[PDB]
Write a structure and sequence with these properties.
The complex is a heterotrimer.
Chain A: H1 2-23, H2 29-33, E1 46-50, E2 57-62, E3 68-73, E4 77-82, E5 88-93, E6 99-104, E7 110-115, E8 120-124, E9 133-138, E10 145-152, E11 155-160, E12 165-169, E13 174-179, E14 186-191, E15 197-202, E16 207-211, E17 217-221, E18 228-233, E19 239-244, E20 249-253, E21 258-263, E22 272-277, E23 283-288, E24 293-297, E25 303-307, E26 314-319, E27 326-330, E28 335-338
Antiparallel strand pairs in A: 1-28, 2-3, 3-4, 4-5, 6-7, 7-8, 8-9, 10-11, 11-12, 12-13, 14-15, 15-16, 16-17, 18-19, 19-20, 20-21, 22-23, 23-24, 24-25, 26-27, 27-28
Chain B: H1 2-16, H2 23-37
Chain C: H1 9-19, H2 25-29, H3 32-45, H4 50-63, H5 68-79, H6 82-89, H7 96-107, H8 117-127, H9 130-137, H10 139-151, E1 161-169, E2 173-180, E3 186-193, H11 194-199, H12 203-216, E4 227-232, E5 236-241, H13 249-256, H14 261-280, E6 283-284, E7 293-295, E8 301-303, E9 310-311, H15 329-332, H16 341-356, H17 369-377, H18 389-398, H19 414-419, H20 428-432, H21 459-464, E10 470-471, H22 473-481, H23 485-505, E11 520-527, E12 536-543, E13 546-550, E14 558-561, E15 565-572, E16 577-583, E17 587-592, H24 596-618
Antiparallel strand pairs in C: 1-2, 2-3, 3-5, 4-5, 4-10, 6-9, 7-8, 11-12, 11-17, 12-13, 13-14, 15-16, 16-17
Helix pairs in contact in C: 1-10, 1-24, 3-4, 3-10, 4-5, 4-6, 4-8, 14-16
The chains are: A mainly beta, B mainly alpha, C alpha+beta.
Bound molecules: the ligand O=C(Cc1cc([C@@H]2CCNC[C@H]2COc2ccc3c(c2)OCO3)ccc1F)NCCc1cn[nH]c1 and magnesium ion.
């Protein structure tokens, strides 16, 4: 039959990919980095505590100025914070209680957010008048909004429980490109530093690399045993990390088209919620359902340090663009800024 | 579905027909990147209190 | 005095009423306060509806006009009028057909009070739809919600009545003249003693009295002592009734002596309309006798005490129920079914006692109960020669032993009795309007004018009276309408205008519930830990994933998530129902609401919102609880 045969040729193509990946696996990252010194013990203090959400925090995103950040919470608000003073620059009550994600536009002119309303709402931070207004409600997904990241003031990429991602033209309110291919809820996305590519991580345990302009899935990365909750590009754009419910993070390389490293410990059994690199890429910071942030040597795989300042899940985190600090957000309703 | 399964084949063919580099070279490039940028990384290379916006300081801009 | 809850009461009440199907044009427009607030809305705030409602009220005045000359004049004024023209001027005029029916009866000089009924029906079909939906949106529906909150939270006690002189005495209790303190309305309080009811085994009697009063008390019958309220205290049952301070007719018969034909005719006509009302509701009275006829200060009369009455719409009674000298044959025969038949026979006996001084089956003052009955069953009664022929025809009509021959049982009810020769002089509409001069105007302050010829309370005793309290909605609304409605509305209007200005000088719009997905909001009182906290009144906002609360002068700073809530239960704390929320980690959150509908609605909404939130959270990978130990 036709269906019998198309399945068999798919399987055979999967074997040829596997074989060509193995042909590239001449050594390991771990062997290559044996000669560099360990980073030693990474130790940070809590320099700010950001108080004001009234229930769990689900997400956060730094502004490009390394100073303002936006958080989203079970309390049905976004708060935009001045991390230097701790003052609330804006407090935005949402139309839907069920927000899950948020994003700061690079310009600082907009934030976005959304969740179980299946909408990506765009907020204009300084109107003609000087007020905070909903400027656009991006409707079109068929399931929840899991992540969103602006390319610029008129374009944003979204991921969704409906298993797709999309590129939107904010002015028209329309999906310009739809990225189809995952077979489970898409949980997270990260844009390459040049914004021609993005990667997504999903509940099908895979990550995919997408071409923004041409609409296709370029590469698919497997190995996680369970949901990928979080993903983030290494700072030169040639690799990325994931965090999963299988209690591991992993490093994937684009040009080698495969996994380079696993970051795990027999004593860490819970899920990872959030990942980000330090400015040079040497540290990989991840948030955990055990209420910690663990800091990994991205080159050598050793655990370098622990940020233990929350009384419930660390649900989100992020390193500033200037590399000066890391924010952690938690189910305990606080963010902390550390260095 | 036969349309679906043919779509999977076409997709996998795009995934298969890419140029790949050796891991040893991909790894050396990541290492070199970290090494070139180690000194500008404040979480790695802790800065003096005076350069750190979040220590010993009340007077800020904007 | 009545203090209305604040307008935000609407958030709870609108929902509570929608859940019961109560927010429709028909349910609101037919309530007196509903009508008054809808009218206000239409006359003053919605130009397209104003002429419809003005016309509607002209017709309502026309309907109540006593003479045919008045209605010839007024029907012509109405037809030849500006409101009539305003209604052709609009693009929703009356139909050719309705206009033809009206102007056809007009030109042939015939002006029944329902002349304009097809106009009423067309008006209402146009008030239905958008105009009604605009009323619902307005502040006049908010105000309806405020009044309705008060209606549905009535819990009367003795302290709500200023209680005065005794105006009647029986075996079970006494009746008093009283004034309801919040409105100033005058009433009778029939106050029955529970110890004395237990002693004499008349519990089913007290209770049947209440169900019968409920069946009968709407429609404002001028000829029955109807109920506005029932309530109870630990020792007393209490019925709040039409005030009748003129004593009963058993006492007046014994003082005046017997009554002339003309005098009795006044009493009979009034009684007949009381019976008609009851039989139209499938109620047989059964105990018609002069001690159950009461007089007002003017001498107009009403039937009272429905204790022995019965509902016959479903099951016709068999039993021998009444007083021995007034019970019909088909009643005295146990296991012969009967309907309203019984009252017409009893009426006959009673109109005989007013003329002669004794029932027609109690011959020589005698009390042989068995013999009174044999006379009713066997001999037809000789009517003394002195009775007029018209009166003879009436009593021979009413006292037929066979129901199938008896006046009022031949298939047209009271109308058969009203047509009797004996009543030829009467205009029955004038009887209805209490226009006839009564025969006996009671002397003011007359003492002992309504006396009849004459142990612990278990929790099982109290349990029999569980469903005794009752408010007759139409009676309370009429009381309010005719006393304090207008003044309270004005005062309340001024209070709300004032909170509004003050709120805006402060920089405060009470807008926190708006533009979000808030399900319901309002005041409740809270308590946490019983040692650490106490009752604090706060303002709550229920959202799909949490319940937030605030004090005065700040937005909410505290909440419980729907996730944390394990259950919502009723529970008693010092003779008052509260809500008990069990919270994850064995904590407790307790709520007290300000009114009965609020407790019902907060319970339902909390329960619905926590169950839906938890089933939803469980499907969302990022929000659900994940395993933390193997
Ligand atoms: O005691 C009452 C009811 C009652 C009746 C009366 C009066 C007894 C004499 N006939 C007229 C009755 C009604 O008196 C009224 C007097 C004034 C009223 C009124 C009723 O309604 C409005 O204003 C006064 C208080 C009462 F509580 N019934 C006893 C029935 C019984 C059962 N076993 N043995 C006896
Ligand atoms: Mg019988």
């Amino acid at each position: 039959s036709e269906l019998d045969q198309l399945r068999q040729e798919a399987e055979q193509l999967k074997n040829q990919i596997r074989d060509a990946r193995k042909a590239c696996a001449d050594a390991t990252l771990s062997q290559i980095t044996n000669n560099i010194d360990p980073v030693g013990r990474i130790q940070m203090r809590t320099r700010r505590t950001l108080r004001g959400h009234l229930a769990k925090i689900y997400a956060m995103h730094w502004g490009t100025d390394s100073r303002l950040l936006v958080s989203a919470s079970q309390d049905g608000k976004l708060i935009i914070w001045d991390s230097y003073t701790t003052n609330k620059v804006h407090a935005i009550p949402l139309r839907s209680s069920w927000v899950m994600t948020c994003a700061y536009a690079p310009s600082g002119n907009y934030v976005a957010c959304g969740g179980l309303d299946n909408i990506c709402s765009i907020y204009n931070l300084k109107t003609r008048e000087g007020n905070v207004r909903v400027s656009r409600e991006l409707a079109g997904h068929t399931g929840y909004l899991s992540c969103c990241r602006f390319l610029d003031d008129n374009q944003i990429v979204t991921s969704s429980g409906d298993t797709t991602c999309a590129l939107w033209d904010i002015e028209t309110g329309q999906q310009t490109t739809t990225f189809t291919g995952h077979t489970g809820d898409v949980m997270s996305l990260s844009l390459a530093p040049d914004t021609r590519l993005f990667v997504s991580g999903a509940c099908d345990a895979s990550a995919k690399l997408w071409d923004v302009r041409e609409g296709m899935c370029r590469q698919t990365f497997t190995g996680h045993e369970s949901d990928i909750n979080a993903i983030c590009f290494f700072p030169n754009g040639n690799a990325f990390a994931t965090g999963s419910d299988d209690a591991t993070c992993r490093l994937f390389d684009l040009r080698a088209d495969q996994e380079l490293m696993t970051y795990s410990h027999d004593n860490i059994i819970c899920g990872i919620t959030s990942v980000s690199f330090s400015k040079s890429g040497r540290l990989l910071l991840a948030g955990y359902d055990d209420f910690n942030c663990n800091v990994w040597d991205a080159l050598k795989a050793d655990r370098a340090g622990v940020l233990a300042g929350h009384d419930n899940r660390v649900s989100c985190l992020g390193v500033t663009d200037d590399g000066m600090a890391v924010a952690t957000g938690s189910w305990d309703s606080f963010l902390k800024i550390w260095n | 579905s036969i349309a679906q399964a043919r779509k999977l084949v076409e997709q996998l063919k795009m995934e298969a027909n890419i140029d790949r580099i050796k891991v040893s070279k991909a790894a050396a490039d990541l290492m070199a990147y970290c090494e070139a940028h180690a000194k500008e990384d404040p979480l790695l290379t802790p800065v003096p209190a005076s350069e750190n916006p979040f220590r010993e300081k009340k007077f800020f801009c904007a | 005095k009545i203090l209305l809850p604040e307008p935000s009461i609407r958030s709870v009440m609108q929902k509570y009423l929608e859940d019961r199907g109560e927010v429709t044009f028909e349910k609101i427009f037919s309530q007196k306060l509903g009508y008054l607030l809808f009218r206000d809305f239409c006359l003053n705030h919605l130009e397209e509806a104003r002429p419809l409602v003005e016309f509607y009220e002209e017709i309502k005045k026309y309907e109540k006009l006593e003479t045919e000359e008045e209605r010839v004049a007024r029907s012509r004024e109405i037809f030849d009028s500006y409101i009539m023209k305003e209604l052709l001027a609009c693009s929703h005029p009356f139909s050719k057909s309705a206009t033809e029916h009206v102007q056809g009866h007009l030109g042939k000089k015939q002006v029944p009070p329902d002349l304009f009924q097809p106009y009423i029906e067309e008006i209402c079909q146009n008030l239905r739809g958008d105009v009604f939906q605009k009323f619902i949106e307005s502040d006049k529906f908010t105000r309806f919600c405020q009044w309705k909150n008060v209606e549905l939270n009535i819990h009367l006690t003795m302290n709500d009545f200023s209680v005065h002189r005794i105006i009647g005495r029986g075996g079970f209790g006494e009746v008093y003249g009283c004034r309801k303190a919040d409105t100033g309305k005058m009433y009778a309080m029939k106050c029955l003693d529970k110890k004395r009811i237990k002693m004499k085994q008349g519990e089913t009697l007290a209770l049947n009295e209440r169900i019968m009063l409920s069946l009968v008390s709407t429609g404002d019958c001028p000829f029955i002592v109807c109920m506005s309220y029932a309530f109870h205290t630990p020792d007393k049952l209490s019925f709040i009734l039409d005030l009748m301070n003129g004593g009963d007719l058993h006492y007046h018969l014994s003082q005046h002596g017997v009554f002339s034909e003309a005098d009795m005719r006044f009493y009979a006509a009034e009684i007949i309309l009381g019976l008609e009302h009851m039989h139209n509701r499938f109620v047989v009275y059964r105990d018609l006798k002069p001690a159950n006829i009461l007089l007002d200060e003017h001498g107009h009369v009403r039937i009272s005490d429905l204790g022995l009455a019965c509902d016959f719409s479903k099951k016709k009674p068999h039993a021998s129920v009444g007083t021995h000298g007034y019970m019909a044959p088909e009643v005295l025969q146990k296991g012969v079914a009967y309907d309203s038949s019984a009252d017409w026979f009893s009426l006959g006996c009673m109109l005989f006692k007013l003329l002669r001084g004794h029932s027609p089956f109690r011959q020589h003052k005698t009390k042989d109960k068995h013999e009174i009955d044999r006379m009713t069953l066997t001999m037809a009664v000789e009517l003394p020669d002195s009775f007029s022929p018209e009166l003879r025809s009436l009593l021979e009509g009413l006292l037929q032993r066979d129901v199938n021959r008896r006046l009022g049982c031949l298939g047209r009810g009271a109308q058969e009795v009203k047509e009797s020769p004996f009543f030829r002089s009467l205009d029955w509409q004038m009887v209805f309007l209490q226009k006839y001069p009564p025969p006996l105007i009671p002397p003011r302050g007359e003492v002992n004018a309504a006396d009849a010829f004459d142990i612990k309370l278990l929790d099982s005793d109290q349990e029999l009276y569980r469903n005794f309290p009752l408010t007759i909605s139409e009676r309370w609304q009429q009381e309010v309408a005719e006393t304090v409605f207008d003044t309270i509305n004005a005062e309340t209007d001024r209070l709300e205008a004032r909170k509004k200005a003050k709120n805006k000088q402060l920089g405060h719009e009470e807008d926190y519930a708006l533009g979000k997905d808030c399900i319901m909001h309002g005041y409740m009182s809270k308590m946490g830990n019983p040692f650490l906290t106490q009752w604090q009144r706060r303002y709550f906002y229920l959202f799909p994933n949490r319940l937030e609360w605030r004090g005065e002068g700040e937005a909410p700073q505290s909440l419980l998530t729907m996730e944390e809530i394990q259950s919502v239960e009723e529970t008693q704390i010092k003779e008052r129902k509260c809500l008990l929320l069990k919270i994850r980690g064995g904590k407790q959150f307790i709520l007290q609401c300000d009114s009965d509908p609020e407790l019902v609605q907060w319970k339902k909404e909390l329960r619905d919102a926590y169950r839906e939130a938890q089933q939803l959270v469980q499907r969302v990978p990022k929000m659900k609880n994940k395993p933390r130990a193997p």
